[PDB]
Design a binder for this molecule. Structure first.
Ligand SMILES: Oc1cc(F)ccc1CNc1ncccc1-c1ncccn1
Lengths: 242, 258
């Protein structure tokens, strides 16, 4: 019968892989600014997801061909013994695209690799994409206009965005991104007990409550950040200790 | 001695103890000005009535509008955005129509979704600040084998997803019948797959379940639906995957009001 509280089965041998694509600088021809603070984000995420049982693999400043090769490689190995899959992008972006070192990649191309017909062993399992990407312009706060569309994907995907249309993404050059900081704080405290979209909702509250009435940089005043997640999940998702 | 200090609470819920639940608007579009070259939407009136009963049972004041022109629709939604919602828990707005990109069709023209949600952001609607603003959108691509000229068996019509899964402001929840690359289904007597399943879940669980948890059940119900191969073989590969884009900041329940 229909169960209103059904949860994803998370009792496989492994939690699964968490991929992190970390982009700090870009080929000069793209004329994009460096992303100081992103290495703090990478380390923060690595610790949180490792603690949740994930096998975390980080890749710094891959070219687009290299990045596509790597994510395709992961999409074609067996996830039969895994609970789920996580993929994080830390970069600049525009519209449907995220930047690699030398060129843009379409988000739909990346998510498409993990759809049922392409990745059988993840069918019915959570596929979670976390995207910290917006428009490229001592602890300094950099402020970027939202630019990356809050795109959906297939069944059992969860697409998590640092910022919604009309708002602004913030990154501290020492402490890291507002969104990743608050995400990681919540993961550390509640990741192993709370339902994951409930947790992302806490992240929405934390980030949107950060004040922008008195910035060190006067030009940043009033540039609020509101994250968003787009859920195509079909069950409750927990990361209880394995 | 106990009280809730202002510490971060992982279980915080929207306060839903106002005098009224709030207004639920339903914009119901069954047919369109001939110049738009859009097909009729048989079954949408079942959707409208279904939604009216479920949201009324949850305490909402439901107001339905059928086939408004774009000017009329904008006037009406602007009217609602400019009254005081001080005594309300929340606000619901439903669109049942065709759509394309960031647009929903009214009777005679397209309207941009951001124009509609924009009316309810921050100071434009102060009395809804910090309160859930829930938009439910059943809108996809009208099949246009259908002349540019001036014009009950249960059939399942299948429309490609066309409307962007747009976000909005803080405390908005944007609910979409279908995601990019999938297909929306509507039975000409029984109504839309998404609305049918939304309404069934509202009736069974609406008064207890956290609302995004309920929307997740709707995702499961809809994405598991299949058409019978005999009635329409051409619909075989056309799965429906709904989604919701949450900018909510707290848990949302619709417990019966005291
Ligand atoms: O979500 C956003 C985030 C931003 F930073 C800026 C603008 C938008 C709104 N646009 C979209 N949002 C979701 C899905 C598709 C689109 C979309 N797709 C094509 C063209 C326009 N919008």
């Amino acid at each position: 019968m229909f169960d209103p509280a059904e949860k994803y089965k998370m009792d496989h041998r492994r939690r699964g892989i968490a991929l992190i694509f970390n982009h700090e600088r870009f080929f000069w021809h793209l004329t994009l600014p460096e992303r100081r603070g992103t290495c703090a984000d990478r380390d923060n995420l690595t610790r949180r997801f490792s603690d949740l049982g994930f096998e975390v693999k980080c890749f710094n400043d891959l070219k687009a061909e290299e990045l596509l090769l790597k994510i395709h490689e992961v999409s074609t190995v067996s996830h039969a013994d895994a609970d789920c899959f996580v993929c994080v992008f830390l970069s600049h972006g525009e519209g449907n695209h995220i930047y690699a070192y030398d060129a843009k990649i379409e988000i739909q191309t990346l998510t498409g690799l993990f759809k049922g017909d392409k990745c059988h062993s993840l069918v019915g399992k959570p596929k979670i994409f976390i995207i910290q990407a917006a428009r490229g312009n001592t602890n300094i706060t950099e402020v970027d206009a939202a630019s990356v569309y809050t795109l959906p994907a297939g069944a059992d995907f969860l697409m998590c965005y640092s910022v919604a249309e009309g708002y602004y993404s913030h990154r501290e050059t020492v402490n890291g991104s507002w969104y990743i900081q608050d995400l990681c704080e919540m993961l550390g405290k509640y990741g192993s007990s709370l339902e994951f979209t409930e947790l992302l909702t806490l992240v929405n509250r934390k980030v949107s409550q950060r004040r922008v009435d008195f910035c060190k940089d006067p030009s940043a005043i009033g540039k609020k950040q509101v994250p968003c997640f787009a859920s195509m999940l079909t069950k409750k998702l927990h990361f209880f200790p394995k």
